[PDB]
Coordinates of C-alpha atoms and ligand atoms in Angstrom, one line a residue:
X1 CA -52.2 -53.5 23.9
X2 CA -52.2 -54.3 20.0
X3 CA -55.4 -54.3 18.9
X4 CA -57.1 -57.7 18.6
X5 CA -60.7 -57.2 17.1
X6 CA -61.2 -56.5 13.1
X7 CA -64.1 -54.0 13.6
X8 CA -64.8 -53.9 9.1
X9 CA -68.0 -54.1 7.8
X10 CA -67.8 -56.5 4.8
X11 CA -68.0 -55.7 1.3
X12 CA -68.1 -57.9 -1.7
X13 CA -67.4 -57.4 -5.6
X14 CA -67.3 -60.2 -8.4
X15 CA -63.8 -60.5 -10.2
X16 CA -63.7 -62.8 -13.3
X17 CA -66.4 -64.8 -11.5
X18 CA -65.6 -64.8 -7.8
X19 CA -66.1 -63.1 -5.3
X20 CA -63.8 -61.0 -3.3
X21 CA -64.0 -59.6 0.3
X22 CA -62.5 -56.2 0.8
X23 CA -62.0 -53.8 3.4
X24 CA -63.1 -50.0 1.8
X25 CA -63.3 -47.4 4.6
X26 CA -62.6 -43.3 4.9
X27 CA -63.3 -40.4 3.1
X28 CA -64.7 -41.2 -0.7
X29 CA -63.3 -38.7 -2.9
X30 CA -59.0 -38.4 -3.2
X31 CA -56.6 -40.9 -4.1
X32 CA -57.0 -44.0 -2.6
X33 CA -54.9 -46.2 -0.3
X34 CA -54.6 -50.1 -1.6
X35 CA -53.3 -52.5 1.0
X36 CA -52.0 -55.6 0.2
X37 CA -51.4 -58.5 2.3
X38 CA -49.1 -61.2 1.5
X39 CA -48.7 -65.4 2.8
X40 CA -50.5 -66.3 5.5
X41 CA -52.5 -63.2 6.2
X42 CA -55.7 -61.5 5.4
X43 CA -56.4 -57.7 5.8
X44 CA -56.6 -58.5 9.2
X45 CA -52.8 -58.1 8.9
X46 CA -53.6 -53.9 8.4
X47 CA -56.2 -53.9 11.1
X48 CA -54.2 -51.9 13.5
X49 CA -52.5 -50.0 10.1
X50 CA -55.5 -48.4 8.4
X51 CA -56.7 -46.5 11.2
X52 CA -54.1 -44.1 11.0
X53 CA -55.2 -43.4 7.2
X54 CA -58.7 -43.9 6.7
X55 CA -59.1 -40.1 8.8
X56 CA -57.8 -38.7 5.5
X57 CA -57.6 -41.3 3.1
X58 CA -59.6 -44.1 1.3
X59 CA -58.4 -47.4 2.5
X60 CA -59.6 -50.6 0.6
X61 CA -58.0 -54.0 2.0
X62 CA -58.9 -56.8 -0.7
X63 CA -58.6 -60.3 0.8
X64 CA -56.3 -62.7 -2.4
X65 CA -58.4 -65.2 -4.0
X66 CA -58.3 -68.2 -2.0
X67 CA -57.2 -66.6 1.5
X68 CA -59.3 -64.2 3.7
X69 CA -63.1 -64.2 3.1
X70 CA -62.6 -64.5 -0.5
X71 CA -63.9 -67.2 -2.5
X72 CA -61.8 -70.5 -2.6
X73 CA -61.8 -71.7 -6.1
X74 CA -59.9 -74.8 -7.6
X75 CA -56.9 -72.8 -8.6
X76 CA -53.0 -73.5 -8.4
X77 CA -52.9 -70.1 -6.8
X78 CA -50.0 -69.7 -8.8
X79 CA -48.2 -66.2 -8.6
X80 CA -49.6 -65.6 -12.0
X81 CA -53.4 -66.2 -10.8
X82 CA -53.3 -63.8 -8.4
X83 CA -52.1 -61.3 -10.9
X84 CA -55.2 -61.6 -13.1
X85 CA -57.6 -61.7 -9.9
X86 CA -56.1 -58.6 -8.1
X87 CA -55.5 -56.7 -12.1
X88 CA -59.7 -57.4 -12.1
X89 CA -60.1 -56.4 -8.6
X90 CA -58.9 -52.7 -9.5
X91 CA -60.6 -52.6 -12.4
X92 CA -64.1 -53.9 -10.9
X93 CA -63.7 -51.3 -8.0
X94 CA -62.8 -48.7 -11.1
X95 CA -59.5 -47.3 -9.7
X96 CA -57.8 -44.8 -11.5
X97 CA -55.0 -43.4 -9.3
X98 CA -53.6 -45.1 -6.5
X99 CA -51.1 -44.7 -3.6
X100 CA -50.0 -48.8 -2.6
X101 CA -49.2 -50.2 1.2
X102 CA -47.9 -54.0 0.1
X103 CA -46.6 -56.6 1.9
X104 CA -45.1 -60.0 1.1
X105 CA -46.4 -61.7 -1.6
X106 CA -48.8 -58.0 -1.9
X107 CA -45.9 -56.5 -3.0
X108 CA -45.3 -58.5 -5.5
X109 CA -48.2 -58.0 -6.6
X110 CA -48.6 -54.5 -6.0
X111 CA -45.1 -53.6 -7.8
X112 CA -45.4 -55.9 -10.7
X113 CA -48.9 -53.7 -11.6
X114 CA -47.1 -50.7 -10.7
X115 CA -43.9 -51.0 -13.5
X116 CA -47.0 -52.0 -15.9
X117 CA -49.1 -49.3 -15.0
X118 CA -46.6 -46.2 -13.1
X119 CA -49.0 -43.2 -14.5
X120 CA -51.4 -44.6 -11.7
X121 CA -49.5 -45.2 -8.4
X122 CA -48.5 -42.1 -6.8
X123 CA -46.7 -43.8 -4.0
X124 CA -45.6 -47.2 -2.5
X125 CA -45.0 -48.3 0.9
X126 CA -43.6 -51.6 1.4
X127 CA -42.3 -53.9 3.9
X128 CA -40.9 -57.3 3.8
X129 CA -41.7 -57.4 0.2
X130 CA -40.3 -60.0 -2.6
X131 CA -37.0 -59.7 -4.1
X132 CA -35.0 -62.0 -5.7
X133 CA -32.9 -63.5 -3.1
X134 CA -29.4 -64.9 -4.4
X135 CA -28.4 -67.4 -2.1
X136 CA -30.1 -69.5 0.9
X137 CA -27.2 -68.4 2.8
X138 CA -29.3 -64.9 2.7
X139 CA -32.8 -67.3 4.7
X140 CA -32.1 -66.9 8.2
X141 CA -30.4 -69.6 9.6
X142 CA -33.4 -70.6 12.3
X143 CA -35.7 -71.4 9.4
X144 CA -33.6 -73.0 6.4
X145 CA -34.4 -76.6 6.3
X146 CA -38.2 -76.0 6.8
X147 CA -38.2 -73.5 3.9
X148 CA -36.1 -75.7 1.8
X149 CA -38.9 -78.9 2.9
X150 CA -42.0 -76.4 1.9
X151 CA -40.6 -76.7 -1.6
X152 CA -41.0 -80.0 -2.1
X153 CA -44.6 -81.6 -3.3
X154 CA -44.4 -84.8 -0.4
X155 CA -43.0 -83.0 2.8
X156 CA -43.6 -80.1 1.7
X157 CA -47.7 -80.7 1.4
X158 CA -47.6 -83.0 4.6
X159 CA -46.5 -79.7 6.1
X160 CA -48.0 -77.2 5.1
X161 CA -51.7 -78.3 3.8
X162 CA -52.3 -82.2 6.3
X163 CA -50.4 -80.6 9.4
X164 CA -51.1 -76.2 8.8
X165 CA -47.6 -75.9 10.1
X166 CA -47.2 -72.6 7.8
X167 CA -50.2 -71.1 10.5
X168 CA -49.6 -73.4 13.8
X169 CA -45.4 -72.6 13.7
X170 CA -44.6 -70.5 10.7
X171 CA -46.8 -67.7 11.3
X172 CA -45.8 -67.4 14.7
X173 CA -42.4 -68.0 13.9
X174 CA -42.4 -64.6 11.6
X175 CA -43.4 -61.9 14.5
X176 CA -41.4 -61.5 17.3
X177 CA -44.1 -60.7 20.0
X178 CA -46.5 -63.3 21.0
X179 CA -49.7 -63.3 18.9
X180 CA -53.0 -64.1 21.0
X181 CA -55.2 -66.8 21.2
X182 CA -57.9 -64.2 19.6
X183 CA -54.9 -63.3 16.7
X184 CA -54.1 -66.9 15.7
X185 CA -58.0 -67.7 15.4
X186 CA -58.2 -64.7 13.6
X187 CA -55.6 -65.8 11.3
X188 CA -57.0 -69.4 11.3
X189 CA -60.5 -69.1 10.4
X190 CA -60.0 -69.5 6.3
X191 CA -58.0 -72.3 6.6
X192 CA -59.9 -74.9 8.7
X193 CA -60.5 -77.5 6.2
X194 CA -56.9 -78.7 5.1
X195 CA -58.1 -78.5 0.8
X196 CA -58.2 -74.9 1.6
X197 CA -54.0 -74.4 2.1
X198 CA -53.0 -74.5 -1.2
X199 CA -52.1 -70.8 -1.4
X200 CA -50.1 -71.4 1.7
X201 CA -48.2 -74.2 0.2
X202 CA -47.9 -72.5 -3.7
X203 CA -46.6 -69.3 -2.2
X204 CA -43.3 -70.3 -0.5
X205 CA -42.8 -72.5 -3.7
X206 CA -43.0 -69.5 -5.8
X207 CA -40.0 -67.5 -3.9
X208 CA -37.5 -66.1 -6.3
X209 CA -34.4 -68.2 -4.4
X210 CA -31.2 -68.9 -5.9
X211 CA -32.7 -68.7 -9.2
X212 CA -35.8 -70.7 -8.7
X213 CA -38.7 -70.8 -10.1
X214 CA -36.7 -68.9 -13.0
X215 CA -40.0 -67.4 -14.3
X216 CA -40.6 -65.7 -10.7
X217 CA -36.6 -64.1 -10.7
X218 CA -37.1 -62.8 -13.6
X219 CA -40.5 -61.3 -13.5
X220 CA -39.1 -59.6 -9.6
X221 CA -35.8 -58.9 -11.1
X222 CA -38.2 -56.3 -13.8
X223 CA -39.8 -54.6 -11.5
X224 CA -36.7 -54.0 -9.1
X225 CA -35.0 -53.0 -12.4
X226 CA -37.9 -50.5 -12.3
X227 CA -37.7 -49.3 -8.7
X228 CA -34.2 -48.5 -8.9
X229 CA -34.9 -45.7 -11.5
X230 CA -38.8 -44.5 -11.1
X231 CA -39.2 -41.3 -9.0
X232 CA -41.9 -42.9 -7.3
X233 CA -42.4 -41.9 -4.3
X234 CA -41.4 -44.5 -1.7
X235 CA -40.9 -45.6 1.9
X236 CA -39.5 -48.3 2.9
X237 CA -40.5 -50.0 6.9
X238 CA -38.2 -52.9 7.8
X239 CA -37.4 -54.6 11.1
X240 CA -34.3 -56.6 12.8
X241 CA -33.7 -59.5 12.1
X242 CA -36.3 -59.5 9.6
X243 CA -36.8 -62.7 7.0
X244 CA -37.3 -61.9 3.5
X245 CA -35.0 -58.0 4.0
X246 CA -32.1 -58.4 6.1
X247 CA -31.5 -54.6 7.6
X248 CA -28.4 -54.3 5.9
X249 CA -30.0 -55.1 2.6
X250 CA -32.9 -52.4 3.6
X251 CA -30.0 -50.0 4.6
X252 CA -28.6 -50.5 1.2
X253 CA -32.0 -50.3 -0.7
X254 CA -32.6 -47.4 1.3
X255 CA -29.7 -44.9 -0.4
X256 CA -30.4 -46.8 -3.7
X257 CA -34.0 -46.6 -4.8
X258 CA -34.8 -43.0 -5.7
X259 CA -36.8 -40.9 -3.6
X260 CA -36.9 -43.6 -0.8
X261 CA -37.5 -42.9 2.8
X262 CA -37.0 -45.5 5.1
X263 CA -38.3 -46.3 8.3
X264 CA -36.7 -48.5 11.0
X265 CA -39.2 -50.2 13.3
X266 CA -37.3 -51.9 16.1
X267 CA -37.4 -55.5 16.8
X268 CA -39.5 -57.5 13.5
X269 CA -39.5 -60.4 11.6
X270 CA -41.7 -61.0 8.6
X271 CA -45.0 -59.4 9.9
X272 CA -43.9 -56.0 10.9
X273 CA -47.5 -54.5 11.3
X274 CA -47.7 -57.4 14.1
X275 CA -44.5 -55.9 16.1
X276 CA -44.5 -51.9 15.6
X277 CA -48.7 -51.0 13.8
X278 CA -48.1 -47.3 15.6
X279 CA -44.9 -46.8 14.2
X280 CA -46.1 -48.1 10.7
X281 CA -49.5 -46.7 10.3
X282 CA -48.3 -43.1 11.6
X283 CA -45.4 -42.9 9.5
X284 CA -47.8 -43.9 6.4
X285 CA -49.9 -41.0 7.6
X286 CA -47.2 -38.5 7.9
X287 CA -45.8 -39.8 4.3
X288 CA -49.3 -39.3 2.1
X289 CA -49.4 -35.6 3.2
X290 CA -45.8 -35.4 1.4
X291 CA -47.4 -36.9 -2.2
X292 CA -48.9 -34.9 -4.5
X293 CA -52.2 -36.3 -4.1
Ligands
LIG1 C1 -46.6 -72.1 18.5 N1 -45.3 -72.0 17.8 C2 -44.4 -70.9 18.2 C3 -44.8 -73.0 17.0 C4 -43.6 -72.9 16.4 C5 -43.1 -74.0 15.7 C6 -43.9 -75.1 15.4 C7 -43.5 -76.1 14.5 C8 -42.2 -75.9 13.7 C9 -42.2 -74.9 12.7 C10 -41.1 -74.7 12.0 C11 -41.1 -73.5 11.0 O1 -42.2 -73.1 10.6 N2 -40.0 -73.0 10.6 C12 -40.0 -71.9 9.6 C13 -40.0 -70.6 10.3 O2 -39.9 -69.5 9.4 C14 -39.8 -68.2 10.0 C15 -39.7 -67.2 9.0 O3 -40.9 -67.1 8.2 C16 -41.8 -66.2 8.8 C17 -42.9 -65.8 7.9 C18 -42.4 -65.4 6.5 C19 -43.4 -65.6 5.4 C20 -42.8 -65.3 4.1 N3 -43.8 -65.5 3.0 S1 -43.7 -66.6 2.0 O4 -43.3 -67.9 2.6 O5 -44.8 -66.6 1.1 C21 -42.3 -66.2 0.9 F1 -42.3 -67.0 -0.1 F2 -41.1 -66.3 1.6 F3 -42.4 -65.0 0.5 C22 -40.0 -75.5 12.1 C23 -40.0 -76.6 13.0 C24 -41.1 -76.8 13.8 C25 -41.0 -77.9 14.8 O6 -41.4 -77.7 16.0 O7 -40.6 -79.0 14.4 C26 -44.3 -77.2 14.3 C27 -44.0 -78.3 13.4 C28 -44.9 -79.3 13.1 C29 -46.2 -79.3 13.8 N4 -47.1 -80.3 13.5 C30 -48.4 -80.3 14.2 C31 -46.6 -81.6 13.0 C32 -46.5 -78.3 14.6 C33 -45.6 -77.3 14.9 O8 -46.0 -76.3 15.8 C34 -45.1 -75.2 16.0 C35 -45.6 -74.2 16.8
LIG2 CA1 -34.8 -37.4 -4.9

């Protein structure tokens, strides 16, 4: 079956005064493989990824400030803090070149540092990643209202940080096979005290939606601006339904963005590593011995 355990040895580095948890396994030298996880995961979202890469490649797995086994500070985990903790997080691990594997709200961040920094990312692969979606007509149906109630500071916080319905319902809700007991504790453990959720709750309230926040739109709307022209190497993994990337809007993406391979996994939702990891982590495998790197 999918693989439940998380088998990483630890590993810690202080960025701008916290500390970070990150998964950093395979071979030392060569370009290394950043993975980014998104809301309401943790590398444990790459667990079943990484082993198809770390034979050949570096793979490091930072967990966001405020989620994983990172440190929890007083923040407003807006979209914006996470940009200055993971742009210190490379630097503190003294990354040069990179190839990115983002997700969510990883990607984000992993293509907003990418259009500021293209001479060091040699590759992206992304899935379910943040684009500025034009109408709620384009949220699936089966989860409108309860997005719409996230982004509100009364239901919205009942929700999401007094009840954890974002990783009791939502979570759940955005894979299409059933996660085990053993998953969801996996998936629970940083969040057990409620004044811990705040990332859960600032995340869905930073989706670029119909033009709001208009700060987030335009900042995504930049760096898609910028995929649609770089010859970055890409490829592109995306499910049916899905949640934040219709398939026809993948399809599309697909024979737009230059040098884009894309990958259909089967039956997915939002957490695609959840539904298809062999698919996914071979495919990233087969991909890197394409690059240059
Ligand atoms: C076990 N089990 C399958 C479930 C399933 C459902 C529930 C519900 C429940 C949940 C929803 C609900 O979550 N609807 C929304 C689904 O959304 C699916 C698409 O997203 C997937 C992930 C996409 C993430 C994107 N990232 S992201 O946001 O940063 C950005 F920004 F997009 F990028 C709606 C209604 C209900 C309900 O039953 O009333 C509960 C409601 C309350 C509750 N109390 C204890 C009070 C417990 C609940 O127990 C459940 C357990
Ligand atoms: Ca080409």
């Amino acid at each position: 079956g999918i693989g439940t355990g998380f088998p990483f040895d630890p590993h810690y580095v202080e960025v701008l005064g916290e500390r970070m948890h990150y998964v950093d396994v395979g071979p030392r030298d060569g370009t290394p493989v950043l993975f980014l996880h998104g809301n309401p995961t943790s590398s444990y979202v790459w667990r079943n990824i990484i082993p198809h890469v770390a034979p050949t490649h570096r793979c490091i797995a930072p967990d966001l400030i405020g989620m994983g086994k990172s440190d929890k500070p007083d923040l407003g985990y807006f979209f914006d803090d996470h940009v200055r903790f993971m742009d210190a997080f490379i630097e503190a691990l003294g990354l040069e070149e990179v190839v990115l594997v983002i997700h969510d709200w990883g990607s984000a961040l992993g293509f907003h540092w990418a259009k500021r920094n293209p001479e060091r990312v040699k590759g992206i692969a992304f899935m379910e990643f943040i684009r500025p979606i034009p109408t709620w007509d384009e949220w699936p149906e089966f989860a409108r209202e309860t997005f719409q109630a996230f982004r509100t500071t009364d239901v919205g916080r009942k929700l999401i940080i007094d009840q954890n319905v974002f990783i009791e319902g939502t979570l759940p809700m955005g894979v299409v096979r059933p996660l085990t007991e053993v998953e969801m504790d996996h998936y629970r453990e940083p969040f057990l005290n409620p004044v811990d959720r705040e990332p859960l709750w600032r995340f869905p309230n930073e989706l670029p939606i119909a033009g709001e926040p208009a700060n987030i739109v335009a900042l995504v709307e930049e760096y898609m601006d910028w995929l649609h022209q770089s010859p970055v190497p890409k490829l592109l993994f995306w499910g049916t339904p899905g949640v934040l990337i219709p398939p026809a809007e993948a399809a599309r993406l697909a024979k737009s963005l230059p040098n884009c391979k894309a990958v259909d996994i089967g039956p997915g939702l939002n957490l695609l590593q959840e539904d298809n990891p062999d698919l996914i982590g071979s495919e990233i495998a087969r991909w890197l011995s394409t690059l240059e790197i």
